[PDB]
Amino acid sequence: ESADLRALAKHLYDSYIKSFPLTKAKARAILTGKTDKSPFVIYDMNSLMMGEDKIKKEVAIRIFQGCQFRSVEAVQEITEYAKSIPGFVNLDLNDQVTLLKYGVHEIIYTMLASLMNKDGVLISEGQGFMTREFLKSLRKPFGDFMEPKFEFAVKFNALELDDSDLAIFIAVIILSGDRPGLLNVKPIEDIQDNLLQALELQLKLNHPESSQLFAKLLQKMTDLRQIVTEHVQLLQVIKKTETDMSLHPLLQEIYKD
Ligand SMILES: *[C@@H](/C=C/CC(=O)CCC(=O)O)C/C=C\C/C=C\C/C=C\C/C=C\CC
Numbered sequence: 001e002s003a004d005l006r007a008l009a010k011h012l013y014d015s016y017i018k019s020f021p022l023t024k025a026k027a028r029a030i031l032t033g034k035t036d037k038s039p040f041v042i043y044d045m046n047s048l049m050m051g052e053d054k055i056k057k058e059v060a061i062r063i064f065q066g067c068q069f070r071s072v073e074a075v076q077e078i079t080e081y082a083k084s085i086p087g088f089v090n091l092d093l094n095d096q097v098t099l100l101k102y103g104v105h106e107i108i109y110t111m112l113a114s115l116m117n118k119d120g121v122l123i124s125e126g127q128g129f130m131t132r133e134f135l136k137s138l139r140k141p142f143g144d145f146m147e148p149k150f151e152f153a154v155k156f157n158a159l160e161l162d163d164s165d166l167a168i169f170i171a172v173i174i175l176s177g178d179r180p181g182l183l184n185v186k187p188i189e190d191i192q193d194n195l196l197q198a199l200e201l202q203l204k205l206n207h208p209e210s211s212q213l214f215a216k217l218l219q220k221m222t223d224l225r226q227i228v229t230e231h232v233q234l235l236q237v238i239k240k241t242e243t244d245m246s247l248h249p250l251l252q253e254i255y256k257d
Contacts, residue, residue, distance in 0.1 A: 008086065008198045009168055015084035016167035019077050022125055023163050024114035030126045031117055039122065039129040048134075055128040060142040061245060063135075064238075066123075072248050074108045075100075078170070085171050087191040092183050099188070101254050103174040105231070106224045110170060113153040121146070141237050148230055152223055159217060165206055168199040169217060173224075180257075232257075 017023065030037045040055055042048050048059065057065075079100055082088050088096065115122040120131040135146045161169070177189040203213045210216075232255065238245065 002201065005198045005201045008194065009164065009202050011086070012084075012167040012171055012198070013164040015081055016163060016170075019081040019084070020111070021077075022115070022122075024111075024161075024166065025163055026126065027114045027122060030122065031129075037126065039127060041120075041129045041131065042123075043131040043134050051128055056124045060138045061242070063138070064142055064145070065245075068248050068251060071105075071108055072250050074111075075104050075250060075254070078104060078107050078174075081170070082174055085174065085191070086194075087187075088175070091187060095179075095182050095184060095188065098179050098181050099174055099176065102179045103176065104254055105228050106173050106221070107170045109149060109152060109224060109227055110156070110173070111166070112149060113156045114166075116150060116153040116157070118150070118154050121150075141234070141241060145231075145234055148227055152227055155223070156220055159213065159220075160207075160210070161217070162206070165199075165202055165217075168195060168202055171195050172199055173221065 026037075030039060040047075040051055042051050045059065082096075082100060088099075091099075112121070115126075119133070120129055121135075122128070123130050132146070132150050136143055138145075172192060172195045175188055175192040175195060177185040177192060182188065199217075200214050203210070203217070207213050235255065239247075
């Protein structure tokens with residue numbers, strides 16, 4: 001039934017809104033130019049220095065540790081969104097964990113897109129905007145830790161997806177039956193079918209002229225996994241050249257792999 005699938009979509013979009021403070025709708029309103037939502041822009045050290053005057057150790061390390069604590073917040077939000085996914089809580093508690101462990105970052109970078117444009121990314125809930133050039137000018141080896149993200153975004157953002165489409169897509173990602181260490185794959189794969197079903201209808205109804213967007217979008221999951229692995233490697237270098245740099249526990253458990 002179309003109606004059954006449309007219902008599940010409605011249900012998801014709804015949980016999505018309740019779980020994420022900064023939707024793409026808002027993110028775009030702020031980047032577009034739609035006077036009371038205008039961000040302070042950080043493009044150099046001095047602006048950075050001035051940012052803390054109104055926006056919410058070392059400069060590169062202070063920024064990196066900023067992303068850390070921020071993703072830890074993202075994990076808590078996605079984890080809450082997961083629970084609302086019909087069937088996810090009924091799954092084995094161990095696989096409930098495994099899925100989150102492998103789906104967390106893929107999702108963070110998908111939604112991180114909503115906050116970017118070719119020349120920069122929104123920070124602190126949209127209060128600010130840090131340019132892509134500044135981050136790139138970060139002392140090695142922190143200079144290129146956002147570069148491959150920006151490339152993903154410009155490509156992904158090109159699909160023109162809105163919040164309702166994403167809610168189902170990040171749902172499809174979490175319920176991936178091909179995760180390392182899954183005990184019961186069958187139950188997980190049946191939920192995803194439903195999700196893929198929902199998504200497929202969603203895109204067709206929401207993007208009538210965008211041919212094979214369903215397939216186009218699904219292919220992006222390759223770019224996402226690509227990005228994660230590149231990150232893990234970088235992280236390995238960091239921990240060696242920066243033995244005096246700590247990592248948030250939650251973020252370390254997820255990385256043990
Ligand atoms: C940087 C986030 C990068 C995500 C990442 O790869 C690290 C995650 C991990 O597990 O290692 C920030 C991206 C967007 C900014 C959004 C909000 C502001 C948070 C940090 C930005 C720096 C200072 C602002 C407080």
